[PDB]
Amino acid sequence: NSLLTMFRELKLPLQIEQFERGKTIFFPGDPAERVYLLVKGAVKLSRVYESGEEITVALLRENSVFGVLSLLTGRSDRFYHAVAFTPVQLFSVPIEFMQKALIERPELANVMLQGLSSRILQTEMMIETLAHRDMGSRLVSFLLILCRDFGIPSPDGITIDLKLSHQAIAEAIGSTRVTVTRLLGDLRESKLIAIHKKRITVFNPVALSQQ
Amino acid sequence: ENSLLTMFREIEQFERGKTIFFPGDPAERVYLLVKGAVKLSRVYESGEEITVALLRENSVFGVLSLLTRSDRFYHAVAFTPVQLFSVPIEFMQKALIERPELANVMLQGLSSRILQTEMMIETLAHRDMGSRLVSFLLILCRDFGIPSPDGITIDLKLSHQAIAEAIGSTRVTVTRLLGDLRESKLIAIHKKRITVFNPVALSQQFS
Ligand SMILES: O=C(O)CCC(=O)C(=O)O
Ligand SMILES: O=C(O)CCC(=O)C(=O)O
Predict the structure, then answer these.
(1) Rounded to whole angstroms, how far apart are CA atoms A194 and A14?
(2) A120 vs B contacts (CB less than 8 Å)
(3) In CA terms, which of A180, A211, B135, B204 is 20 to 30 Å from A55?
(4) How far, in Å, CA of B102 to CA of A143, rounded?
């Protein structure tokens, strides 16, 4: 909760911004002039290669601070591509307002420090996921992250609340569409997960951890 | 600048291989790595290890403590000989509440670690093991590189096993790929240190 209440107040109030699914929040090349708080939805940070291929660096969940490059002072240019993965609501602030707002309303550098601490650890989770030698573990590991980040209770289990193309999954776990199609499909038959409308449900993740 | 030094100081020596913290430890402290390299690892009891982060100089770590306690789940080790400052949370939380101008540097410090961890994702993201190696080697050149006529010398005693545990591979493959890299006149291993000639050329391998 806390982060919302910090950002909002940052003399006139801060308006929430809407972003349609697929709309860019920032392009590689833009000046890194801003910090953001993702309020609702999912934002995908991606690295684009001159080769054409993209890699997902982070699928960020709600109440996440991002754009964090702007805090490094000296400005700089974005090198990642920030996109609304789902429909997105966020606050953005120019860097300077954050410097002062933190200084003055003192309690809340602690909220930003916790916000940023949260992000470091989450990324380190993603590394652990990407390091598994066998791709199936990666998938399961990734799916489990998506359950606690985007999971919504169903009668039939926990349901990752995202339109996830297999291609999307491919670009996050460092694989290809064909492999993930086969792995998923083999978790479907194993009665370990279920898929409808591009959304995945993992039964008893507690269990999926144990196998 | 760095100036994180200048905040923290208001030093501990650690021997190559000594533990800074183990899983099971309480998460009661924050650290600033002043000199050397610290390796955060995840131990898959039972048996093997995976490197989550090789941290370079002037890095804040132990960051779990800032989440308000908990227990460490990673293993913090002096990869080289290490100099660091450590502070209990309470002194640090208090300090930041009493003197709330020292937060900007911490915010930049933590931002940097996010950006650096994201690099390691770019690396492990590659499907091709050779690209991972090159990607990883290049990071090590920025982070631990010394200058050198034709390129850059990673200033670490790096076992191939170490490299294996960072890039998600095995010792046999690293030793092999380094060979192919070497035999292409792209790196050298002299007095136990990897030197990568003309990295910028090689960094165009990606983009
Ligand atoms: O992880 C983030 O917050 C995005 C990184 C960033 O700010 C950039 O690439 O400019
Ligand atoms: O990345 C770090 O700072 C170390 C993570 C940590 O503090 C822990 O595992 O307890």
Answers:
(1) 41
(2) 63, 110, 113-114, 117
(3) A211
(4) 38
Of residues A49, A58, A110, nearest to B118 (C-beta): A58
* CA B121 – CA A20 distance, rounded (Å): 27
Which chain A residues are closer than 8 Å to B64 by Cβ? Answer: 117, 121
**What resolution in angstroms, rounded to 1 decimal?**
3.0
Domain at A1-119: CATH code: 2.60.120.10
Instruction: Provide the angle, in degrees to the nearest 10, between the axes of the packed helices B160-167 and B171-183.
Output: 100
- A188 in Cβ contact with A203 (< 8 Å): no
Handedness of CA B22, B27, B29, B35 (dihedral sign): positive
Encoded tokens for A143 = 């799916």
Do the domains B1-113 and B114-207 sit in the same CATH topology, yes or no? Answer: no
Give the ligand whose atoms come closest to the C-alpha of residue A71: 1
Contacts of A123 in chain B (CB under 8 A): 114, 117-118, 121
For A129, the token pair is 């996921």
Q: A35 CA to middle of ligand 1, Å?
A: 9
Which atom of ligand 1 sits closest to the CA of residue A119? Answer: 1
**Protein fold of B1-113:** Jelly Rolls (2.60.120)
CB A180 within 8 A of CB A143: no
A158: part of which helix (H) or strand (E)? strand A157-160
| A113·B112 Cβ contact <8 A | no
Query: CA-to-CA distance for B57 and B43, rounded, in angstroms?
Result: 24
> Which two structure tokens, joined as six digits, stand for A29?
């090349």
Closest ligand to the CA of B74? 2
Residue A70 CA: distances (Å) to CA of A32, A106, A113: 5, 20, 15
Q: Solved how?
A: X-ray
Question: How many residues belong to chain A?
Answer: 211
Q: In what order do the strands lie in the sheet with B59-61?
A: B12-14, B82-88, B29-35, B59-61
* Closest ligand 1 atom to A26 CA: 10
Closest CA to ligand 2's atom 5:
B62
Structural fold of domain A120-211: Arc Repressor Mutant, subunit A (1.10.10)
Domain boundaries of chain B, sorted by first residue:
1-113, 114-207
The CATH number for B114-207, chosen from 1.10.10.10, 3.30.980.10, 3.40.50.2000, 1.10.8.60, is 1.10.10.10
CA distance A163 to B61: 35
Q: Do A127 and B125 touch (CB under 8 A)?
A: no
